Amino acid sequence: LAEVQALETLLTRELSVFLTEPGSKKTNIINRITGKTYALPSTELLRLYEHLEQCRKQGALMYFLERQGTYSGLMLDYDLKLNTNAVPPLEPPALSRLCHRIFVHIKNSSVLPEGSHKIHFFFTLKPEVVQGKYGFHVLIPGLKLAASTKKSIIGSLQHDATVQKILHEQGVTNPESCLDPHSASVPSLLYGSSKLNHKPYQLKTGFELVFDSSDPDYIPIHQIKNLESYNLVSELSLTNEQGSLVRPVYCAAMLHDPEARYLHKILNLLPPEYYVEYPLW
Amino acid sequence: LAEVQALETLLTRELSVFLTEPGSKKTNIINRITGKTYALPSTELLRLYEHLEQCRKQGALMYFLERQGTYSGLMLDYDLKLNTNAVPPLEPPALSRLCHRIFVHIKNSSVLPEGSHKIHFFFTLKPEVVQGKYGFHVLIPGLKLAASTKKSIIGSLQHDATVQKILHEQGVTNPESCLDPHSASVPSLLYGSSKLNHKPYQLKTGFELVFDSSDPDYIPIHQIKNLESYNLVSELSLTNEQGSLVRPVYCAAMLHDPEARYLHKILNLLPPEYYVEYPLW
Numbered sequence A, B: 001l002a003e004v005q006a007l008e009t010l011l012t013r014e015l016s017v018f019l020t021e022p023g024s025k026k027t028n029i030i031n032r033i034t035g036k037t038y039a040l041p042s043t044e045l046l047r048l049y050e051h052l053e054q055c056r057k058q059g060a061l062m063y064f065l066e067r068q069g070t071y072s073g074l075m076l077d078y079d080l081k082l083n084t085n086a087v088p089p090l091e092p093p094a095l096s097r098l099c100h101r102i103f104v105h106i107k108n109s110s111v112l113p114e115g116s117h118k119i120h121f122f123f124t125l126k127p128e129v130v131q132g133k134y135g136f137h138v139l140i141p142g143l144k145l146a147a148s149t150k151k152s153i154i155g156s157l158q159h160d161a162t163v164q165k166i167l168h169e170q171g172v173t174n175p176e177s178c179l180d181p182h183s184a185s186v187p188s189l190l191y192g193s194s195k196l197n198h199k200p201y202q203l204k205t206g207f208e209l210v211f212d213s214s215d216p217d218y219i220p221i222h223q224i225k226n227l228e229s230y231n232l233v234s235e236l237s238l239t240n241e242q243g244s245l246v247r248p249v250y251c252a253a254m255l256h257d258p259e260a261r262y263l264h265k266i267l268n269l270l271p272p273e274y275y276v277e278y279p280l281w
Helices: A003-019 A043-059 A094-106 A147-158 A159-171 A232-236 B002-019 B044-055 B092-108 B146-157 B162-169 B232-236 B265-271
Strands: A027-033 A037-038 A064-066 A071-081 A116-126 A135-148 A204-213 A221-223 B030-031 B036-038 B063-067 B071-081 B116-127 B134-145 B200-214 B221-223
Touching: A003 A043, A003 A147, A027 A147, A027 A204, A043 A232, A043 B146, A071 A147, A094 A116, A094 A135, A094 A147, A094 A159, A094 A221, A135 A147, B002 B036, B002 B044, B044 B200, B044 B232, B092 B116, B092 B134, B092 B146, B092 B162, B092 B200, B092 B221, B116 B232, B134 B146, B134 B232
Parallel strands: none
Antiparallel strands: A027 A037, A027 A064, A071 A135, A116 A135, A116 A204, A204 A221, B030 B036, B030 B063, B071 B134, B116 B134, B116 B200, B200 B221
């Protein structure tokens, strides 16, 4: 495929010069398919996002992660157990109310800057329910938060009675324990990417929240209408600062490497029945 | 014209049985062209609104007023003096902020019912500036208020510094004295109607405000997208209770007919200084 070939050329010929060592702090981008780690400057991050976006629109297999580090956008990872194997409705009013409640906790952290600011919420959903297991990500990529503040906001969100109600009425049986408390620290999948055993989450709905310190009781939340007009890998990225839709608002602060060849014996080192080993160890 | 003929037949053959006497309190509808006053029950009000709406869509001359009485929707009448003879921009953000400020005064009146409620704001604008004179109506037809509460809300709105700022930045030179303090009591033009010397105000933008007593800091004002889908005479009526878009929320409690021929006589009669006439009376 042309756009995959283009991404391959960008990675090997050009971005190879930004390859980081394992466990490097500078790393911002992880390609879990090639097992490569990169520290991309903003210019080269954007070029990557243009290629990943073209690959996304053609349904190409991607497994890119961004590292959140100490100061970046907020991601909420919800792992739902459902009543049934039916995708829950999750219509705009429920998602709109979720945004409001998420914002109340952000505001209560006291780190928002004074003045008038737009922040965008994006809901990406697991494409199907598998054995009653369902998922969504809430991405607030533009709202640049300290890791410690994200952890605090996530702690508060787990105990939110209104959020638990919304999730319950959607058919969620684990509304108390569905929000991953490590949402603040885990590397976050780029839009169009997934674990190799899963399919990528799909953008259902995005919302624009405006807050004004002078008028704190007015918190307008509206659906974003022309989402398709933007580079979604770009806009949804927690570490991006050069989005068009998403403009930053700054808040107060495995080594065996088989390389697709040697792992085959791994596939037959599991179904030995060799638990008990008197001579067989 | 067919729809005017239809309205004429409805008025003379059918609604004539609801004709009220001059100064009757039962009056809810005034046809200032025919000089007739009516007390229409809800069923016949709707039939009227269907005919007026058809007449409106074809640009027919209407001069219908509704009487606000003691308990009905809120109307704000703004008479603007402008910097220039250019229509002020009045884009959604300015009008959105106006709605929020108007709501703060409604909330402060203490009369809103507990629970979750949608209220709709409609802004109808004077079609052109004439000698720097401009106007808009703010209609909140669904929010059923006592006359005394409307007067109180209007009093507070006149002194609102944020509203005065918004109007100032639009080029208004009378931001302190542009809101008619009798907005609560005056008979209110039906959408598509006007004084015989003026043209009807045009609906520019409508907004949906949701309030929730349990979550008072969340006040999302969603603009309304499919306005054309509704009967606008119906929805915008302060006294209507059977709108489709606008569902009521209950708060705690001469004849000219110039035919464009004698307007010329008026235009040539005023300029002489013969208002007093000792030899030429």
